[PDB]
Amino acid sequence: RGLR
Amino acid sequence: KNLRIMLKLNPYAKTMRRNTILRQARNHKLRVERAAAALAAKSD
């Protein structure tokens, strides 16, 4: 979720 | 012998090899500059  | 085979088994090997290459080249650059200064010092 953080990466996107 | 095969670099990409090593990274498949030990990805950290790429870090160690990159560090060695950068360190060894840096240590060589010091010895020439040290040596060059000494030779110039002798010429004085």
Binding site: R4 | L3, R4, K14, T15, R17, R18, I21, L22
Partner: protein, 223 residues
Amino acid sequence: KGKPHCSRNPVLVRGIGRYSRSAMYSRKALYKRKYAALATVTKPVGGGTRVVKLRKMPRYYPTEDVPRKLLSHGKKPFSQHVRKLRASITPGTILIILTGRHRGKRVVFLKQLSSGLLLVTGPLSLNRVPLRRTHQKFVIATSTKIDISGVKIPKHLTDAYFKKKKLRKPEKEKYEITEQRKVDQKAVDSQILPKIKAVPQLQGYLRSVFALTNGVYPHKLVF
């Protein structure tokens, strides 16, 4: 779309970049570059119109067929291979040809062609070797060099230029020197020849052939 950018990771050694993952992460500014989630042609006919299949099923099938190969990597075609040149072969170097009708003759190395073959010239007037391709494995690179840095080699002198054309027979068919080649030979020779004559006894050296004689051993002598 954006224009391609040159790689921000310089090559340290083959397969290893200069910068680590986090170093490249910053250099590429990925902290702000975040992103989140026919077979037929209709034709009229003189029914009214027909749907035409662009590719038709085979009209024949052999009794047996071979299976598909497994997939490999690193097996490029010849045109995509990297070309290598011995460090002792620089433009203006004198080379000794070792094979063919021109064996033993000393020639001037001009450039390495895209296929990797060398381009050389006698020049023709000195040893009757024209603009001709030669393979590097079959030449000895001597230590004698003229400076041909100011010589303008025509750009059409490419691999396709020197590729042999097939001749047919049913008696015999003879090769002919096209008038273009003669013109190209003179243009290149006129620039190299004056530079050869600048070095004393060099034009005579290029006229003379190489041979092994009594007591002469290649591993002992410098070329």
